[PDB]
Design a protein around this ligand. Structure first.
Ligand SMILES: *[C@@H]1O[C@H](CO)[C@@H](O[C@@H]2O[C@H](CO)[C@@H](O[C@@H]3O[C@H](CO[C@H]4O[C@H](CO)[C@@H](O)[C@H](O)[C@@H]4O)[C@@H](O)[C@H](O[C@H]4O[C@H](CO)[C@@H](O)[C@H](O)[C@@H]4O)[C@@H]3O)[C@H](O)[C@H]2NC(C)=O)[C@H](O)[C@H]1NC(C)=O
Ligand SMILES: *[C@@H]1O[C@H](CO)[C@@H](O[C@@H]2O[C@H](CO)[C@@H](O[C@@H]3O[C@H](CO)[C@@H](O)[C@H](O)[C@@H]3O)[C@H](O)[C@H]2NC(C)=O)[C@H](O)[C@H]1NC(C)=O
Ligand SMILES: *[C@@H]1O[C@H](CO)[C@@H](O[C@@H]2O[C@H](CO)[C@@H](O[C@@H]3O[C@H](CO)[C@@H](O)[C@H](O)[C@@H]3O)[C@H](O)[C@H]2NC(C)=O)[C@H](O)[C@H]1NC(C)=O
Ligand SMILES: *[C@@H]1O[C@H](CO)[C@@H](O[C@@H]2O[C@H](CO)[C@@H](O[C@@H]3O[C@H](CO)[C@@H](O)[C@H](O)[C@@H]3O)[C@H](O)[C@H]2NC(C)=O)[C@H](O)[C@H]1NC(C)=O
Ligand SMILES: *[C@@H]1O[C@H](CO)[C@@H](O[C@@H]2O[C@H](CO)[C@@H](O[C@@H]3O[C@H](CO)[C@@H](O)[C@H](O)[C@@H]3O)[C@H](O)[C@H]2NC(C)=O)[C@H](O)[C@H]1NC(C)=O
Ligand SMILES: *[C@@H]1O[C@H](CO)[C@@H](O[C@@H]2O[C@H](CO)[C@@H](O[C@@H]3O[C@H](CO)[C@@H](O)[C@H](O)[C@@H]3O)[C@H](O)[C@H]2NC(C)=O)[C@H](O)[C@H]1NC(C)=O
Ligand SMILES: *[C@@H]1O[C@H](CO)[C@@H](O[C@@H]2O[C@H](CO)[C@@H](O[C@@H]3O[C@H](CO)[C@@H](O)[C@H](O)[C@@H]3O)[C@H](O)[C@H]2NC(C)=O)[C@H](O)[C@H]1NC(C)=O
Ligand SMILES: *[C@@H]1O[C@H](CO)[C@@H](O[C@@H]2O[C@H](CO)[C@@H](O[C@@H]3O[C@H](CO)[C@@H](O)[C@H](O)[C@@H]3O)[C@H](O)[C@H]2NC(C)=O)[C@H](O)[C@H]1NC(C)=O
Ligand SMILES: *[C@@H]1O[C@H](CO)[C@@H](O[C@@H]2O[C@H](CO)[C@@H](O[C@@H]3O[C@H](CO)[C@@H](O)[C@H](O)[C@@H]3O)[C@H](O)[C@H]2NC(C)=O)[C@H](O)[C@H]1NC(C)=O
Ligand SMILES: *[C@@H]1O[C@H](CO[C@@H]2O[C@H](CO)[C@@H](O[C@@H]3O[C@H](CO)[C@@H](O)[C@H](O)[C@@H]3O)[C@H](O)[C@H]2NC(C)=O)[C@@H](O)[C@H](O)[C@H]1NC(C)=O
Ligand SMILES: *[C@@H]1O[C@H](CO)[C@@H](O[C@@H]2O[C@H](CO)[C@@H](O)[C@H](O)[C@H]2NC(C)=O)[C@H](O)[C@H]1NC(C)=O
Ligand SMILES: *[C@@H]1O[C@H](CO)[C@@H](O[C@@H]2O[C@H](CO)[C@@H](O)[C@H](O)[C@H]2NC(C)=O)[C@H](O)[C@H]1NC(C)=O
Ligand SMILES: *[C@@H]1O[C@H](CO)[C@@H](O[C@@H]2O[C@H](CO)[C@@H](O)[C@H](O)[C@H]2NC(C)=O)[C@H](O)[C@H]1NC(C)=O
Ligand SMILES: *[C@@H]1O[C@H](CO)[C@@H](O[C@@H]2O[C@H](CO)[C@@H](O)[C@H](O)[C@H]2NC(C)=O)[C@H](O)[C@H]1NC(C)=O
Ligand SMILES: *[C@@H]1O[C@H](CO)[C@@H](O[C@@H]2O[C@H](CO)[C@@H](O)[C@H](O)[C@H]2NC(C)=O)[C@H](O)[C@H]1NC(C)=O
Ligand SMILES: *[C@@H]1O[C@H](CO)[C@@H](O)[C@H](O)[C@H]1NC(C)=O
Ligand SMILES: *[C@@H]1O[C@H](CO)[C@@H](O)[C@H](O)[C@H]1NC(C)=O
Ligand SMILES: *[C@@H]1O[C@H](CO)[C@@H](O)[C@H](O)[C@H]1NC(C)=O
Ligand SMILES: *[C@@H]1O[C@H](CO)[C@@H](O)[C@H](O)[C@H]1NC(C)=O
Ligand SMILES: *[C@@H]1O[C@H](CO)[C@@H](O)[C@H](O)[C@H]1NC(C)=O
Ligand SMILES: *[C@@H]1O[C@H](CO)[C@@H](O)[C@H](O)[C@H]1NC(C)=O
Lengths: 429, 125, 106, 113, 124, 429
């Protein structure tokens, strides 16, 4: 007899929309995120096997779309810098890293022309003599980020809507896909900081016991390999230059914030890396790769090329965007301290959107951030050398696809829908 | 949260001074701002306060008609406009946050955690 | 009022516990005398919040007292770094300050 | 949620434990819209099931007596083979093939006939 | 709805009278959002009470029978002291930290176990 | 035995969005509300008490947020006045109360400039010779209010959603805090008219028996004292200075309206208050204050506010914005007609926000306005040199915090959530 049972503890894979939650003006403002409940109770589901796939995880796609939208919501009402897309009268004052540029602004009070000057990094300047122009001011609309809002990442706990549950994989040394036998249900994630970076993954979670390397397919050399470390390395990055602030009115309640002067001499940004920790980190990574690849030789060999943001290590310290030269970190081999120079830019092609750009107003200086390296994004060359000199496998830093920054953390979670009805044979009227 | 005073100034008797304070780190309109001066040998003297939202003000009787306080919301800046300065007014003037916050039973009082550097105004013939 | 009759100065050796007081009478109607500490070249800072509450960042050496017309500051285990001018703050329908007490360390 | 990995017999208690409105709860313009839409849909799903149960003659029943004999082509096994062996997840995966048939039969036998 | 100051007993005599429901409405873009949210929530609250009564085995009857004993960890106050010496508001506060516990117990006995027993009768 | 009772008459304090109910353009005359008024009679709750605190009333907070939001939604699509930010050539057409300014406008036609002129109050312009510019041109965006939008406030009733109810104090001599003994329940509040004003509360409700004074605290002089009168005072306000409108083609498909001409002689707006009614009202207020402070002596003085909306009484007559001189009113001592000139302005920094500036249109000069004073907002002044000649306490006009205008009407209401489900011990089963 087909008896109907309601509240049956079963589920099916499903996609829904998760909500923001936090512990605490800023992005990920509390008005838009629910306070996170203390101690959400995790429940272990005994005798449950569940198939996970970190590269097909819609939670990742959702983080990507939501972070972009939120970013735009915050920048949308800020100052357009279009009145400044003019030919500049510009010379100098690492060498000519920073230049003193001037221009005729005709919009500050909207009926007068005034010569104004500002200091700029050469990386934001188009040569066009002493004639210069702002980069991409003629292809994209550049807006200044509003100084009233902090964009500093805080852990965000993403929570399921009612009717849904999040299944978390607790298996030790779990790879990117396949059945997980220690599965628990949770209400929300553990809190992931929305950190944006390229070659190195900063302030993420650590693996337990061993470095775990996950890839959709190692054989396919077009895929990015995510390396999760089980111990972090802390790097101290600074912009030890010192400056003054200036405000050039350019429109009604619409002012441009820039750098007015250099205090003392010019000093380029630099990062403090422990030589020993870095070398040990690479040795254990190479060891795991030697397990994955048939006792082939592991080598790192800088970068094959790409956008400057990929070639250099991109991160954001406070409001200053760093592009560090990491070649010192990636040229070594195994078959069985350190200071890097960094460049600073103010025009950011955020999220790679064509026709859009963001401008980062400066801060006063003497800024240092201590960050945790929790992982790496790498690709294989592979090469065509099969018959001769086939013995070495070379890896290079990779990045730019933001979805990997979230896959590296969301790999343990899956979203399913609760399905309360079912029937079974019994005896009855 | 920080306050920043303008620099020091020197005036003759029968003069006027304009002293500004810039505030940062806490929204200007969420709290009262009080002005106090330090007159060596006398300790501190409370002068007055401004609401910053409604610009209501309150002053000690010995400043009536001589001191005006104002604010500029667009710059989160408060000003002290003091006229008819006497040598008696030599003191270090400070802005100091005021109380805990506007929406509080004793909100205009009990706090004064942020302060500035202070600005000495000297009045002398 | 201007009754916050602070001693002009106090002293004691390092490790000594000391008391600074002003004992104004208009306490009870507001139930409040707070305390500030001023260093040479600096603005006063809050050491005692409301009555006897410690502000964040303030040393555990600091505590206060209120009773009847009593208004006092206690510094236990006096350190050299505590040399400063201490002040009583009260609201007798008006902000009133004490002249201040100069504390030195022997 | 709960002992999903348990036999259906054991899960007869789990069954009623999880029959909470897990489709509703207390949390406390784009983000607001997305969540409002989600809430409305959760309500529709809840009602959809309550309505379907009423259609089959089930109201306020966690275990609802039917008027349809079990059809053995629907992975017969035995009663102990399912109630004291298979979990609800496993069971439904085998019965998924007959869901439409089963529902049509439940409505006609219990109420329309 | 003015019986709140009356004793629990006195007020319960009128639950039918006061069971007004207040669910049917009358007069049948940010403001639109706020009002839409308000309507959706009102529905959600309604359904939560109905789902909860159903899970406990309640028919909608204003006063339900039970299958859970009352015990002294919740309250050891006598019945006259509860029903004739207190208002409902006071009572709810007195036992408020047991709401989750009691609700779980009501469910477990009155409907979870009871339905299992009914299945056994159907098997027989 | 534990039994279940549903429909139990209990509640907990709670907040929720309230519904706007109308009496029957018109945004504050509720073009967007519904006249849900089927004779919503009250029920008295017998022998219950409840704690009210008007200073913590979220209903007040909602009025503030809702009125601002509605204001912006209504004016969002109106004409930007940016094109008028040019240096103006101005003459004196009291001593130049009205300026006659001419200017070069370049927006309706991209390659042309036209000469335009306007007549307007000097109170809206900055001296920079005959060179001037508009006061709110920089730091803020100014929009002209739409000619088809009006803000003519009517009583608005706020209604709880099903599941909620509003409790009201029927107590006489309720001071705004503490318990109320006579408590009734209503689904909707009475209608409260959203009148905007500062020093004096206009077109509100009256106290039932006597002038009453409420404050959160009477020793804290930083609090605003709300005085509610039991009798209204009628004020006759007018601007007899006749005018006519000039339509200026400011932007494409966009029109700006200003004063084109002055008709007849020069006159100023004035308000007529009964001399006696006013002085007798003050006697009553002073009496109540004497009770509060055990005699002393009550004196009334000037606002000394700095900020014109605070200094002068801020008064709204249709599209005419008044700044009335009240120093003739608050000038007395109590130890036991009057015509006020008014200034007129057209740029309003509504709600005190930067970037929300609005320009009032011309109304063809002539206007008659008649309003009821129902209350006052006052601030306490004393405590200075308490030791001597401290027997007199001074009160001054106060205002500018819009939440006080709403608090003065909503003080008697509280919102609670109905919780119909509960349990109790029995003998049954
Ligand atoms: C409008 O009118 C109402 C009266 O209808 C006034 O309400 C009273 O306001 C006062 C002042 O806030 C309240 O006083 C408080 O009493 C507490 C003790 O209450 C218990 O003990 C008394 C003993 O006589 C019993 O009557 C009472 O029922 C309670 O059992 C004190 O604890 C309060 O604070 C004191 O102690 C704490 C200890 O931690 C200290 O930190 C404080 O600094 C302070 O020393 C306080 O004294 C009184 O309870 C209120 N009455 C009612 C019925 O609520 C409103 O003030 C008035 N409003 C205006 C604007 O005038
Ligand atoms: C990446 O994906 C590919 C599938 O697209 C996986 O391919 C697997 O490759 C191995 C190695 O060749 C195959 O194993 C052996 O193949 C020989 C062929 O002659 C056969 O004789 C042996 O008995 C054995 O099957 C394997 O079959 C093949 N998989 C499938 C499904 O065909 C590859 O392993 C993936 N790599 C990673 C890192 O995920
Ligand atoms: C990156 O920055 C961190 C600081 O944020 C550096 O760590 C610091 O290193 C110094 C020098 O080794 C440590 O100083 C020691 O302090 C103890 C205090 O008890 C003293 O007894 C020792 O004699 C010595 O002076 C300091 O404690 C340590 N700080 C922290 C928080 O660990 C780190 O070395 C920098 N990394 C690189 C590669 O430069
Ligand atoms: C996560 O990554 C960040 C960025 O790489 C790490 O550095 C932190 O960066 C913030 C933003 O600049 C620092 O806060 C700032 O401090 C200055 C102090 O003068 C203050 O003026 C600013 O308003 C702001 O509060 C923060 O101190 C800095 N932390 C450290 C240790 O340097 C961050 O440490 C990484 N790890 C974690 C767990 O967040
Ligand atoms: C960049 O380097 C400067 C050093 O030149 C750092 O602080 C500067 O310190 C001087 C000396 O105190 C300040 O000048 C004057 O000080 C007297 C008090 O001695 C004061 O009365 C004067 O009104 C004036 O302030 C100077 O202003 C100050 N510079 C800045 C920008 O604040 C500065 O902190 C270093 N930058 C960063 C980001 O740390
Ligand atoms: C996951 O599978 C394991 C293994 O089947 C379950 O553990 C134990 O399962 C037996 C039935 O196979 C339960 O019944 C009792 O076994 C004892 C054996 O000494 C017997 O004397 C009793 O008369 C009865 O037959 C046993 O209680 C259960 N043990 C525990 C600790 O739970 C396990 O329950 C399964 N997980 C879930 C969530 O169902
Ligand atoms: C306790 O509060 C209640 C509720 O406000 C008070 O009852 C109300 O009393 C007034 C009269 O003062 C009634 O208004 C008038 O009644 C006459 C006679 O029916 C009618 O002709 C008028 O048009 C007007 O309606 C009011 O309706 C009544 N409200 C209710 C709900 O019954 C009560 O008097 C207060 N008791 C104490 C001791 O304060
Ligand atoms: C406004 O806030 C103040 C401060 O919290 C309240 O002050 C209270 O005023 C009463 C009457 O003046 C004081 O009662 C008596 O004080 C004397 C002090 O010498 C004492 O000997 C008596 O035994 C008695 O306690 C009360 O202590 C004082 N409050 C303290 C914490 O609150 C004032 O009443 C508040 N006003 C309003 C309208 O809320
Ligand atoms: C409103 O408040 C003001 C400010 O307190 C009151 O004005 C003050 O009125 C007194 C008495 O007329 C003036 O006293 C005079 O002081 C001079 C000092 O040199 C002395 O020589 C005279 O013989 C006399 O004692 C006081 O100066 C004046 N204050 C100011 C700033 O002008 C005003 O009376 C109050 N009005 C009301 C209605 O309360
Ligand atoms: C239900 O109504 C009660 C009204 O009846 C009487 O009210 C007085 C207070 O006005 C109660 O206390 C008295 O207070 C006097 C002044 O302080 C004292 O002199 C007198 O001795 C006594 O203490 C009186 O007890 C009460 N009578 C009875 C039979 O209860 C009211 O008091 C209740 O608060 C009210 N309850 C609710 C929930 O509204
Ligand atoms: C902007 O353009 C002017 C005009 O060409 C430059 O002025 C000359 O600067 C040189 C020094 O580099 C002097 O020797 C010449 O005498 C200047 N010319 C005149 C007419 O005075 C100016 O240097 C340019 N500035 C920048 C920042 O590029
Ligand atoms: C701002 O505009 C002025 C023109 O008004 C520019 O000055 C001219 O520069 C050219 C080239 O060096 C000279 O031949 C002219 O004689 C200059 N004219 C005058 C009046 O000086 C000036 O270079 C522009 N400045 C900036 C920063 O763009
Ligand atoms: C269960 O129900 C099915 C559906 O009626 C029965 O099988 C059908 O048999 C007819 C021939 O009589 C075929 O044409 C259909 O295609 C079959 N359908 C399916 C889904 O198999 C089946 O015999 C019944 N089984 C029992 C034990 O009662
Ligand atoms: C507007 O601009 C005109 C110039 O185009 C000013 O007119 C002249 O100003 C000079 C200097 O004060 C006088 O000597 C002439 O007599 C003025 N001519 C006329 C016809 O008035 C004029 O004053 C400016 N301002 C206004 C308000 O018109
Ligand atoms: C409005 O309130 C005032 C008090 O603020 C009432 O004034 C009364 O005036 C007479 C003398 O004309 C006195 O004998 C009374 O004692 C006063 N009453 C009070 C409560 O103070 C005035 O009558 C009230 N108006 C109305 C219409 O009731
Ligand atoms: C770079 O190396 C030098 C020498 O060890 C060290 O003094 C410096 O602090 C290092 N890094 C940075 C960012 O300054
Ligand atoms: C029907 O059975 C086949 C296997 O024979 C399976 O692949 C298919 O998914 C089943 N249909 C349903 C609805 O489960
Ligand atoms: C009341 O019931 C709970 C739940 O079963 C139990 O834990 C508690 O000990 C009981 N208390 C008493 C006094 O019976
Ligand atoms: C629930 O907690 C509140 C707050 O502590 C308390 O007032 C109430 O009486 C509690 N209920 C029980 C049964 O303890
Ligand atoms: C417009 O600009 C010209 C510039 O030569 C000036 O002479 C004229 O007076 C201006 N007109 C107005 C109305 O400002
Ligand atoms: C004010 O004081 C005078 C004495 O100076 C006294 O004659 C008069 O009656 C008092 N009355 C009022 C209302 O101020």
């Amino acid at each position: 007899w087909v008896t109907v049972y309601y509240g049956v503890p079963v589920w099916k894979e499903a996609t829904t929309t998760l909500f923001c939650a936090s512990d605490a003006r800023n992005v990920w403002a509390t008005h838009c995120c629910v306070p996170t409940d203390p101690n959400p109770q995790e429940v272990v589901l005994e005798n449950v096997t569940e198939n996970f796939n970190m590269w097909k995880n819609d939670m990742v796609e959702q983080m990507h779309e939501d972070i972009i939208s939120l970013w735009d919501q915050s920048l949308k009402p800020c100052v357009k810098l279009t009145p400044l897309c003019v030919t500049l009268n510009c010379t100098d004052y690492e060498r000519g890293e920073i230049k003193n540029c001037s221009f005729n602004i005709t919009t500050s009070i909207r009926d007068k022309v005034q010569k104004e000057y500002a200091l700029f990094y050469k990386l934001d300047i188009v040569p066009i003599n002493n004639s210069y122009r702002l980069i991409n001011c003629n292809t994209s609309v550049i807006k200044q980020a509003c100084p009233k809002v902090s964009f500093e990442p805080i852990p965000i706990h993403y929570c399921a809507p009612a009717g849904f549950a999040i299944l978390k994989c607790n298996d030790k040394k779990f790879n990117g896909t396949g059945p997980c036998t220690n599965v628990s249900t949770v209400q929300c994630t553990h809190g992931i900081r929305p950190v944006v970076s390229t070659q190195l993954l900063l302030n993420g979670s650590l693996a337990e016991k061993e470095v775990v390397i996950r890839s959709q397919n190692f054989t396919n050399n077009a895929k990015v390999i995510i390396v999760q470390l089980n111990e972090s390395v802390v790097i101290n990055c600074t912009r030890p230059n010192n400056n003054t602030r200036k405000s050039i009115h350019i429109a009604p309640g619409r002012w441009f914030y820039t750098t007015g002067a250099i205090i003392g001499d010019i000093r380029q940004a630099h990062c403090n890396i422990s030589r020993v920790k870095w070398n040990n980190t690479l040795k254990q990574i190479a060891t795991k790769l030697r397990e994955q690849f048939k006792n082939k030789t592991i080598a790192f060999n800088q970068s094959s090329g790409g956008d400057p943001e990929i070639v250099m290590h991109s991160f954001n310290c406070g409001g200053e965007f760093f592009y560090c030269n990491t070649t010192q970190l990636f040229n070594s081999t195994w078959n069985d301290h350190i200071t890097l120079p960094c460049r600073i830019k103010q025009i950011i092609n955020m999220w790679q959107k064509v026709g859009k750009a963001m401008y980062a107003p400066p801060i006063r200086g003497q800024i240092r951030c201590s960050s945790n390296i929790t992982g790496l994004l790498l690709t294989r060359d592979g090469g065509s050398n099969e018959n001769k000199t086939s013995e070495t496998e070379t890896f290079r830093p990779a990045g730019g696809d933001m979805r990997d920054n979230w896959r590296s953390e969301l790999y343990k979670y899956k979203v399913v829908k609760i399905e309360p009805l079912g029937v079974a044979p019994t005896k009855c009227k | 949260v920080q306050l920043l005073e303008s620099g020091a100034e020197v005036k003759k008797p029968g003069a006027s001074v304009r002293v500004s304070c810039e505030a940062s780190g806490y929204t200007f309109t969420k709290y009262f701002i009080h002005w106090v001066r330090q007159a060596p040998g006398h300790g501190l003297e409370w002068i007055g306060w401004i609401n910053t939202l409604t610009s209501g003000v309150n002053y000690a009787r010995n400043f009536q008609g001589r001191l005006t306080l104002t604010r500029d919301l667009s710059t989160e800046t408060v000003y002290m406009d003091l006229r008819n300065l006497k040598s008696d007014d030599t003191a270090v003037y400070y802005c100091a946050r005021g109380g805990r916050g506007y929406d509080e039973p004793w909100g205009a009082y009990t706090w004064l955690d942020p302060w500035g550097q202070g600005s000495l105004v000297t009045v002398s013939s | 009022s201007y009754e916050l009759t602070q001693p002009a100065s106090v002293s004691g050796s390092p490790g000594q516990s000391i008391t600074i007081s002003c004992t104004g009478s208009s306490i009870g109607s507001y139930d409040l005398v707070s305390w500030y500490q001023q260093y040479p070249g600096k603005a006063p800072k809050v050491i005692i919040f409301e009555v006897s509450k410690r502000p964040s960042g303030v040393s555990h050496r600091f505590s206060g007292s209120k009773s009847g017309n009593t208004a006092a500051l206690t510094i236990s285990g006096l350190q050299v770094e505590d040399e400063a001018i201490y002040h009583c703050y009260s609201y007798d329908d008006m902000i009133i300050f004490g002249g201040g007490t100069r504390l030195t360390v022997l | 949620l709960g002992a999903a990995g348990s036999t259906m017999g054991a899960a007869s208690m789990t069954l009623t434990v999880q029959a909470r409105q897990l489709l509703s709860g207390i949390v406390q313009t784009v983000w607001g819209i997305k969540q409002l839409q989600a809430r409305v849909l959760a309500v529709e799903r809840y009602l959809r099931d309550q309505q379907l149960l009423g259609i089959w003659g089930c109201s306020g029943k966690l275990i609802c007596c039917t008027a349809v004999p079990w059809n053995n082509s629907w992975s017969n096994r035995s009663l102990d083979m399912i109630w004291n062996n298979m979990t609800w997840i496993e069971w439904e995966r085998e019965i998924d093939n007959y869901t439409g048939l089963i529902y049509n039969l439940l409505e006609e036998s219990q109420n329309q006939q």
